[PDB]
Design a protein around this nucleic acid. Structure first.
Ligand SMILES: [Mg+2]
Length: 637
DNA sequence: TGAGGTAGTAGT
RNA sequence: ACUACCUCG
């Protein structure tokens, strides 16, 4: 399975000696910014200065003659108005080899690209985006299509051009006109003079000088989700097609040479052997076939509508599943209503006492906040719950079948397990509570084996805490849970993190896995930024592994339709001595272990996928000590 | 709340 | 994160 592919990266000309050694300016601000506003300002100064200049260190580097740049002037930020000055401390050499420096060069590259689009006649430009054609139209509205662009500097002092087809929605109507016809509100609006997106509160029932003002000078709402249905995406061949063009058109007016598509060797990883009681292609099939390992169960039904017992096909469905499945279950019906107060609560008490592992709630669509309340409630009483909206016909097969898969997972049932041998016996994923680092908590889920998966929540608080400890705590708890549920501590773990947050935040975490004598591989997953992958000949397979530079690579976990193009994940092996194929192979296999869908695997590997849902759910509900629940009950899916 | 994917949105 | 477009023996 060795194929060759194109990347939406285009190789260009090697950076000359002047571009490698940009000018270095010193920056003097009055009054002194302050530790965390200085960087934003320098950036905001690089823009004022003009030319191809970006921020480098505490002052900026440039590619435009220091003479042509605006050396003095003023600017405002968060209230304060500052005065700036620039003093040209010569040319400083940058080394593409040095990642840090390779970053100052790359920046200038974006500024350069951004300056060239700025001067393009007859073309719409928005940031680094350029729309060169009209794709759609209609009543005072239209879609322009082009490509989001990017220009960075190679690891070998060369230029790189990234291209990716994109669409742009533009309102042809004006603020009034729009409001006219009978259109609701617009969150953003941009002047008809300068494209300054703006947050408008509403129409000002005010005065009539405001008019003279504009009149003296001689002198439209931005849209998002205000469009009637008469397809935003593109199929890979078409966006592979539009890429080549747009790239050949743009490169043809940047004066850096012919863009040369960068080829790369890929590999078709092995198909995952997904297993229930018998082989199974998608988790749903476990319902007809039978689960891998299935404990007895006891499920409760909570009807919040008018009806009474279990809709027969549901009773059947289950009874048929546990049938082919090893053990058998026992249904239950809660005879209380959330309003019944202590009555209802005491009911959950009996429900959990009498065995019940998870409740299935049949109810008309629930207003967001009512939903969260019921779930938190049932949850404190230690009962995970699956909601299935009531208007339900038995041909809505797919919908109630997911509800069931959820119910079961919420009950702690191992729907399907992966048949085979893998490097890490335990793969745990972490997702942060504070976006940029685990300084403000986070969560983590793992998948092992038997083949059982579980979840973990940070040691209670609110208030900062050394990231690394927060992180080791997450891994520490996960290891424990794995013992009391399998009896044995894994010999090799696979740590998956969302890449955004730094890395050494896992340092102490690794230190411990060291002392505790246990193997490990630390891999970072980035959902976006892995460009695109198009084969040169043949079709686009699923499960493609494409090694890039040192220890980083692109994996394509899915390709489930021919009306869109897949978005490969980028992965970087930052620790461990396991061969990249073994990793890719395991990461690509952990994609079939998500139990809540059952008709389509998620793009990410289940450990990271479950991590995020556990976090969003921890926020949506108000979990602090949801610790009455067994860690193998996926209450958050 | 069925869930997944790819898309877009994220001086006057 | 939110919304739309699909789609799911
Ligand atoms: Mg669910």
């Amino acid at each position: 399975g060795k194929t060759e592919v194109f990347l939406n990266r285009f190789a260009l000309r090697p950076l000359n000696p002047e571009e490698l050694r940009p000018w270095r300016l010193e920056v003097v601000l009055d009054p002194p910014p302050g530790r965390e506003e200085v960087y934003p300002l320098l950036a905001q100064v690089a823009r004022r200065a003009g030319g191809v200049t970006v921020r480098m260190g505490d002052g900026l580097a440039s590619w435009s003659p220091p003479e042509v740049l605006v050396l003095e002037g003023t600017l405002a930020r968060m209230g304060q108005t500052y005065a700036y000055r620039l003093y040209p401390k010569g040319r400083r050499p940058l080394d593409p080899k040095d990642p840090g420096e390779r970053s100052v060069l790359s920046a200038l590259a974006r500024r350069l690209l951004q300056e060239r689009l700025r001067r393009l006649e007859g073309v719409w430009v928005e940031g680094l985006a350029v729309y060169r054609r009209e794709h759609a139209r209609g009543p005072g509205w239209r879609v322009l299509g082009g490509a989001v662009l990017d220009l960075w500097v190679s690891d070998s002092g060369a230029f790189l051009l990234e291209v990716d087809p994109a669409y742009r929605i533009l309102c042809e109507m004006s603020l009034e006109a729009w409001l006219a016809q009978g259109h609701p509100l617009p969150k953003r609006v941009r002047n008809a003079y300068d494209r300054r997106t703006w947050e408008l509160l509403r129409l000002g029932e005010e005065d009539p000088s405001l008019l003279d003002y504009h009149a003296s000078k001689g002198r439209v709402p931005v849209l998002t989700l205000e469009d009637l249905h008469e397809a935003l995406s593109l199929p890979w061949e078409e966006r592979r097609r539009r890429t080549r063009e747009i790239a050949s058109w743009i490169g043809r007016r940047l004066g850096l040479g012919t863009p040369e598509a960068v080829r790369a060797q890929a590999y078709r990883l092995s198909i995952p052997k997904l297993m229930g009681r018998r082989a199974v292609s998608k988790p749903a099939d476990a319902l007809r076939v039978g689960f891998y390992r299935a404990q007895e169960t006891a499920l409760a039904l909570l009807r919040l509508d008018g009806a009474q017992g279990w809709p027969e096909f549901l009773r059947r469905a289950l009874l048929r599943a546990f049938g082919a499945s090893g053990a058998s279950l026992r249904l239950h019906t809660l005879h209380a209503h959330p309003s019944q107060g202590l009555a209802f609560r005491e009911a959950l008490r009996k429900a959990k006492e009498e065995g019940v592992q998870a409740v299935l709630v049949l109810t008309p669509p629930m207003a967001w906040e009512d939903r969260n309340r019921l779930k938190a409630l049932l949850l404190r009483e230690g009962l995970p719950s699956q909601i299935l909206n009531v208007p339900l016909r038995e041909e809505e097969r797919h919908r109630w079948e997911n509800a069931l898969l959820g119910l079961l997972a919420k009950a702690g049932l191992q729907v399907v397990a992966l048949s085979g041998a893998y490097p890490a016996e335990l793969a745990v994923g972490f997702d942060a509570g504070g976006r940029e680092s685990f300084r403000f908590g986070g969560a983590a889920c793992a998948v092992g084996g038997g083949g059982h998966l579980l979840w973990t929540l940070p040691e209670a608080q609110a208030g900062e805490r050394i990231p690394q400890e927060v992180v080791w705590d997450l891994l520490e708890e996960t290891l424990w849970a794995f013992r009391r549920k399998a009896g044995r501590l894994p010999s090799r773990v696979l740590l998956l993190r969302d890449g955004r947050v730094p890395q050494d935040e896992f340092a102490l975490a690794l230190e411990a896995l060291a002392r505790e004598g246990i193997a490990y591989d630390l891999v970072s997953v980035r959902k976006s930024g892995g460009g695109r992958v198009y084969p040169v000949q043949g079709r686009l397979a699923d499960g493609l592994y494409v090694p890039l530079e040192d220890k980083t690579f692109l994996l394509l976990t899915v390709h489930r339709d021919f009306r869109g193009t897949p978005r490969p994940l980028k992965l970087v092996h930052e620790a461990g001595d396991t061969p990249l194929e073994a990793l890719a192979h395991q990461i690509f296999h952990l994609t079939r272990l998500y139990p809540a869908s059952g008709f389509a695997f998620p793009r990410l590997p289940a450990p990271l996928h479950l991590a995020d849902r556990l976090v969003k759910e921890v926020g949506r509900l108000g979990i602090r000590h949801l610790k009455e629940v067994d860690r193998e009950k996926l209450f958050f899916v």
